[PDB]
Amino acid sequence: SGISLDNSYKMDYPEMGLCIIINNKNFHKSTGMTSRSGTDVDAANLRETFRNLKYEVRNKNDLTREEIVELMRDVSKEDHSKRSSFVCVLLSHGEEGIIFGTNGPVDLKKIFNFFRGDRCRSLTGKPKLFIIQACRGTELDCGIETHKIPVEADFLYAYSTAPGYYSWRNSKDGSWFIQSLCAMLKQYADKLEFMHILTRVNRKVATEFESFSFDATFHAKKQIPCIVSMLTKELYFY
């Protein structure tokens, strides 16, 4: 016969999968929210990176909360059967458990749930990756001187910042997290397992980034991303 090594997700389906990017930069005046300058750098970076990983990228810009919800429902209702994985990247204002459409908040759970194993059957047993570049609160980090499978299984949530903390963005370079995310993918998606890649992202953001502000309250601050993993196998992009 033949022996084992099913430790790794099956990534040789005919298609790698969809890569959806929601790029919210311009917010309705009535919401009180600022334009997210530099997010266009992120959105381009992400598209090119996941293009090279052979994902079918779809860039969406400035979506209302209703559009966000409808978008993810529609996509959850697609037949994903010939696809290895699903990828969603959110670039917006946020709070803990919340992403903002242009005109208001969307519960992150409400989005995630469209893809639960019981609810999106052609992704059952396949890696579902949510990449969230957004605030999770208003804490600043001042740093220090050196029934057969769960319906929640096979999700990875790669958050840009720790629970409760601000997430930083550079208007010229793009967000610290997406910058580092893309760069490590380029460098290591042919060499490393995904969790090890995200760990380099944690190191890069932690070590190489520190805020410079004319506002003492916001100056010399630090950031650490947050990997949240329900994956049941190793994920390689080769």
């Binding site: 917006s92 946020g94 957004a134 605030c135 840009s160 997430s167 930083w168 963005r169």
Partner: peptide, 4 residues
């Protein structure tokens, strides 16, 4: 640098 700005908060997001």
């Amino acid at each position: 640098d700005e908060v997001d």
